Amino acid sequence: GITGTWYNQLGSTFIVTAGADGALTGTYESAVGNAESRYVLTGRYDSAPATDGSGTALGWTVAWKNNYRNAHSATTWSGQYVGGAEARINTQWLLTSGTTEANAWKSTLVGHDTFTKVKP
Amino acid sequence: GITGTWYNQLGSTFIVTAGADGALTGTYESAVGRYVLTGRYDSAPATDGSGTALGWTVAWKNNYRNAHSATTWSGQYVGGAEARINTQWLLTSGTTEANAWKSTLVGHDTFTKVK
Amino acid sequence: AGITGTWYNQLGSTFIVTAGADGALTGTYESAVGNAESRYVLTGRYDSAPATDGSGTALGWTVAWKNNYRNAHSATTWSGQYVGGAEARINTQWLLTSGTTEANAWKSTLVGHDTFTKVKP
Amino acid sequence: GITGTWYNQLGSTFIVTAGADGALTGTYESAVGNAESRYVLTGRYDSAPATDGSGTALGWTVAWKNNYRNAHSATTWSGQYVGGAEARINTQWLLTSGTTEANAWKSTLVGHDTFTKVK
Ligand SMILES: COC(=O)c1cccc(-c2cc3c(=O)[nH]ccc3o2)c1
């Protein structure tokens, strides 16, 4: 299922546990950006997905502060887990930096990450 | 300034505690479409007038309903006399692969401390 | 009344547009933000026969941020709908992609939302 | 290197012309290419891109109305062209439907498309 170690297409490492209560907890390590070492993540997932072949909806957040760096920013990933022979988590993400009001129009980056259990 | 009750432009209510460790926890009640929410925020933001970056997730399942979907809000808290949490959001539904191209809605919500 | 006219967004940008009978949007865009100066060409499309059930009119347009004065090596697309009424409005979300190397492509695209009115706020 | 026919990951086709002035014009259609599936597209691209290895920024719009059907919606693609033997147009898109105000919160889908010169 969702619990395990995942890697995105750029080599980031997503170590997650899906708890009985719909909780996602774990750590995220980024290969890009103002990042170093592991960061805390928390999120939620549908603990009772449909039984018609649909994926499992989920999302999580990382605030880019730890004991070694603070980028004053946070990313959220929204997506779905798709089980099968090669399990996959397909996501789109929003990355918001803290800004002044005058710069808020350019505060948010958008992209897409796909995660598998094998390094790219 | 984050802990407390917040209201968006469409009648939803966002009840949150900002923990000392960077955790966001609380409940969300929606007027469109109570649920658990969790997320994270920058616990040491800049002190130069910049906002505080944050994000959170709600999976739309509780003891009464299940929409097989989840929303993430990404944004910043801005303090002052008219404090705001300004966000953009992504809402992904569980779909088949053939319907995955239309699985994700995008929008924006502004939250205030007064209805 | 209609899409054709001069519009302003919440940040002071000026959107001068003509909606042709064939579904074409043409005109100029002037930005109050970013690496921008003077007017830029825009082109886009809109639904020339919208639903009659109270729904808005879908549309979209693109500006590449190159003119005779500057070139930011970037382009914005706005996707949204025109809502008629006593205070006509075009509500949009936008994507702004800059030309980047492959190593920087992950951070090439900004996202936001602009609301346009025929009265300057 | 933009002018020509491009194919996305899900069986859609477009034939675009990139004009000297920055114009994108053409037709967006399905894999089969029957008339009911063809729509006008228009957009813009950076006609003087950087020469440091960066991609070429561009965008375009299709409103989903033709002489045969009307979905009351429009998609914009925003992205960059990357040349070479394995040329690509890498995009993210927004698809907005005309809605009432009460339904406007759910009017916009988001996704991503990658286009190649080979099916
Ligand atoms: C402005 O960006 C930053 O301040 C920053 C700092 C550290 C890491 C990241 C990062 C990693 C990552 C990823 O793996 N997938 C999607 C987004 C994303 O963003 C961003």
Ligand SMILES: COC(=O)c1cccc(-c2cc3c(=O)[nH]ccc3o2)c1
């Ligand atoms: C398939 O189910 C849904 O799409 C669904 C179900 C229940 C609630 C929501 C909901 C509430 C809400 C909000 O307040 N702000 C931004 C997004 C958003 O989405 C969505």
Ligand SMILES: COC(=O)c1cccc(-c2cc3c(=O)[nH]ccc3o2)c1
């Ligand atoms: C990275 O950004 C740029 O290179 C750049 C250059 C010139 C103008 C803009 C600009 C103006 C504008 C607007 O009015 N609404 C939404 C987006 C937006 O973007 C962006």
Ligand SMILES: COC(=O)c1cccc(-c2cc3c(=O)[nH]ccc3o2)c1
């Ligand atoms: C179903 O209702 C719609 O709004 C509609 C109708 C027809 C075609 C499309 C279409 C094709 C296409 C594509 O190739 N890439 C990204 C988006 C996208 O959207 C959407």
